[PDB]
Amino acid sequence: SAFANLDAAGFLQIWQHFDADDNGYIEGKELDDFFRHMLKKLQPKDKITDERVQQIKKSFMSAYDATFDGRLQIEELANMILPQEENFLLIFRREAPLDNSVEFMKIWRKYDADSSGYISAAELKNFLKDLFLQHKKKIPPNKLDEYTDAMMKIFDKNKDGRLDLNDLARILALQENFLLQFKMDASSQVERKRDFEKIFAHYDVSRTGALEGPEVDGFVKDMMELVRPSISGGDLDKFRECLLTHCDMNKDGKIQKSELALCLGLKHKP
Of 252, 162, 157, which is closest to residue 209 (Cα–Cα)? Predict the structure, then answer.
């Protein structure tokens, strides 16, 4: 029921429907329909009307812009709709599509071998160098600088010297981010843990330290079902492969508790 704003990832998903050619614009007379998609994405159960689209659409920009039916460049609509963090993430991903999580995980493992869920902020630029390499991608030294320094802005404000996986994972250019699938609010990173703790407790009957197979499957359904309900059936497989794909170390087929915590936005403090 709370106000729910469109993030950079969502903004792109809807945008692409209108700019499949990726010219970077959409007809300005189509801003009314761009909002119906937004409203339907944010409030999935709401029954949207034409009147509502106008009321919401308008509240999002100047009275003047409301009449702006001309060509709107992607940066313009994003500037009129997305907050900074999600905004900068939109521009960064567009100029540096880094849509390879397989290697993100690997690079994350290097700077966070115990899967605490954080990397020392001192390793940022070093980190951004490796990520581009696994993507075999090269950029100018300055752009790397700007990016490194721009990210410290939205990920290290507390300036406590540490960046969190829940933030850095967001720089990836993935329509549906392998990880960014969970709630990220106040107690949302709390409640999810308690339920994560008891749920990891149940399945690991032998009390070893890792779940394998049915245990991993049972956890998943008895985890995600409550994280983000109304999920498909076959929509647990890639969830189960992505694990031993982007988490566990050896090919044991087991899923360690700490590795598992990472993907949940949570963090297992041993």
Answer: 252
The set of residues, in sequence order, having a beta carbon less than 8 Å from that of 165 and lying 6+ positions away, is: 108, 112, 117, 118, 119, 179, 262
CA dist., res. 184 & res. 188, Å (int):
6
Q: Extract the annotated binding site for Ca(2+).
A: 19, 21, 23, 25, 30, 112, 114, 116, 118, 123, 156, 158, 160, 162, 167, 204, 206, 208, 215, 248, 250, 252, 254, 259
CATH code (residue 115): 1.10.238.10
> Is the domain of 264 the same as that of 213?
yes
CA distance 131 to 229: 32
Give the domain extent around 209.
183-270
Angstrom distance (rounded) from CA 261 to CA 165:
11
Cβ-based neighbour number of residue 111 at 10 Å: 17
Strands (E), the chain: 25-26, 72-73, 118-120, 162-164, 210-212, 254-256
Q: Are 99 and 172 in contact (CB under 8 A)?
A: yes
Check whether residue 7 and residue 50 sit in a common domain: yes
152 lies in the same domain as 214: no
